[PDB]
């Protein structure tokens, strides 16, 4: 039969097969369920979509058409939940907030 | 020259679907590859720990959902749980 990707089966852009292979080779459990790579690929896709959309909005407000680590740093540090998720993370060439009051 | 295997093309499809005209630099792609890898190790480690605590030998979507609820703060967890449940439901129906 014609081969169909599990990413296309799940309606995702992230690789369900590669996430499955990294879950098997990553020494996390003896077995990996079928829906676990689908769930992980969906969660990773949602997180990259949210950070990329906020960084694209920051780049649009900075009148630029390219996302740089400064735009990524602005997008993450201007958000409570993203800053709680990535509090102990240094973004190279990210800078700091302009601390405008 | 030995198949470095990044997430760059998938981050590109996601970027072109949420912002069809903006681009991204190679530095920002490296940042975002590191982000995807870091979140992968966090969620997989929490799910592995949950499966070890409950004396299971398999990691399932229940373990992934509980790891997401433990690690992501606030409405991020709710929206990621919705996205994962939607993708698993779409995958099961094929």
């Amino acid at each position: 039969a014609k081969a169909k990707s599990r990413s296309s089966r799940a309606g995702l852009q992230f690789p369900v097969g590669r996430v499955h292979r990294l879950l098997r080779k990553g020494n996390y459990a003896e077995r990996v369920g079928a829906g676990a790579p689908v769930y992980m690929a969906a969660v990773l896709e949602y997180l990259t979509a949210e950070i990329l959309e906020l960084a694209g909005n920051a780049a649009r407000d900075n009148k630029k058409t390219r996302i740089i680590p400064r735009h990524l740093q602005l997008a993450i540090r201007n958000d409570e939940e993203l800053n709680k998720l990535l509090g102990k993370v240094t973004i190279a060439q990210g800078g700091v907030l302009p601390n405008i009051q | 020259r030995s198949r470095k295997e990044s997430y760059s093309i998938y981050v590109y499809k996601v970027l072109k679907q949420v912002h069809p005209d903006t681009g991204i630099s190679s530095k920002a792609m490296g940042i975002m590859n590191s982000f995807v890898n870091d979140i992968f190790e966090r969620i997989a480690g929490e799910a592995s720990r949950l499966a070890h605590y409950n004396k299971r030998s398999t990691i399932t979507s229940r373990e992934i959902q509980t790891a997401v609820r433990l690690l992501l703060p606030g409405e991020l967890a709710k929206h990621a749980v919705s996205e994962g449940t939607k993708a698993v439901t779409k995958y099961t129906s094929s």
Partner: single-chain antibody, 226 residues
Framework: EVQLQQSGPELVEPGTSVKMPCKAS????????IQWVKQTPRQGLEWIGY????????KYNEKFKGKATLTSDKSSSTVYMELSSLTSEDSAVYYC?????????????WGQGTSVTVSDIKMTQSPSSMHASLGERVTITCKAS??????LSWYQQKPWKSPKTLIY???SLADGVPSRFSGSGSGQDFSLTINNLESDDTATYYC?????????FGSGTKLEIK
């Protein structure tokens, strides 16, 4: 659990300034933006602006800059809004609503409304007023002007009550809303469907986009039962 307390009605003479609170409780106050919505009988719901109490960040509507000024007080978990130089066309009820910083989220919880009286994307709702019995299927169309990437919400407002969120992200059910309600559509075409009617469903239904920077509501659709 989540409550957004406001003040009473302000009988205010023209030319002065008015400030009203939006004291919030039941949730982590800095993690959610507080958005302000005005309501007039003449042109319906209108989005004014918001304050993000995490960094005191604001964004206003184009036509409310100078007319509106938003402030946050982190100590008492209270959001204040300043209206200055009150023109005769400012007699309205002002709602404050909670919206998360996520782009997918919407105004899920609202305040009761402060009636102050003085002494771009256009969203078209195809039905203006519909009538139904207690058991049929009724649909509501929310034809959009520009492309929005499924960033559309549906609200139900009883007469003289705060609006209640039904659908967010154009398909997802809100918290506590039953499976009877169902939303569909993406891009520019959107639809809200009610499975069967009850006497509770007699209300006015609005659709709100939050894709671009000025948030715009729909015209409104009155549903009458039997």
């Amino acid at each position: 659990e989540v409550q957004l307390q406001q003040s009473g009605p302000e009988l205010v003479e023209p030319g002065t300034s008015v400030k009203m609170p939006c004291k919030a409780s039941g949730y982590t106050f800095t993690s959610y933006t507080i958005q302000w919505v005005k309501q007039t009988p003449r042109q319906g719901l209108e989005w004014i602006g918001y304050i993000y109490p995490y960094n005191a960040g604001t964004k206003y509507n184009e036509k409310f800059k100078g007319k509106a000024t938003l402030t946050s007080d982190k100590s008492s978990s209270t959001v204040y809004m300043e209206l200055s130089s009150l023109t005769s066309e400012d007699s309205a009820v002002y709602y404050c609503a909670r919206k998360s910083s996520r782009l997918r989220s919407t105004l899920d919880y609202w305040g009761q409304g402060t009636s102050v009286t003085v002494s771009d994307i256009k969203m078209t709702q195809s039905p203006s007023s519909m009538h139904a019995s207690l058991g049929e299927r009724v649909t509501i169309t929310c034809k959009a002007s520009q492309d929005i990437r499924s960033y559309l919400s549906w609200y139900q407002q009883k007469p003289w009550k705060s609006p209640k969120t039904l659908i967010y992200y154009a398909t997802s059910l809100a918290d506590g809303v039953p499976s009877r309600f169902s939303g569909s559509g993406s891009g520019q075409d959107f639809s809200l469907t009610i499975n069967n009617l009850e006497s509770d469903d007699t209300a006015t239904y609005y659709c709100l986009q939050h894709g671009e920077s000025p948030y715009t509501f729909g015209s409104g659709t009155k549903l009458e039962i039997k």
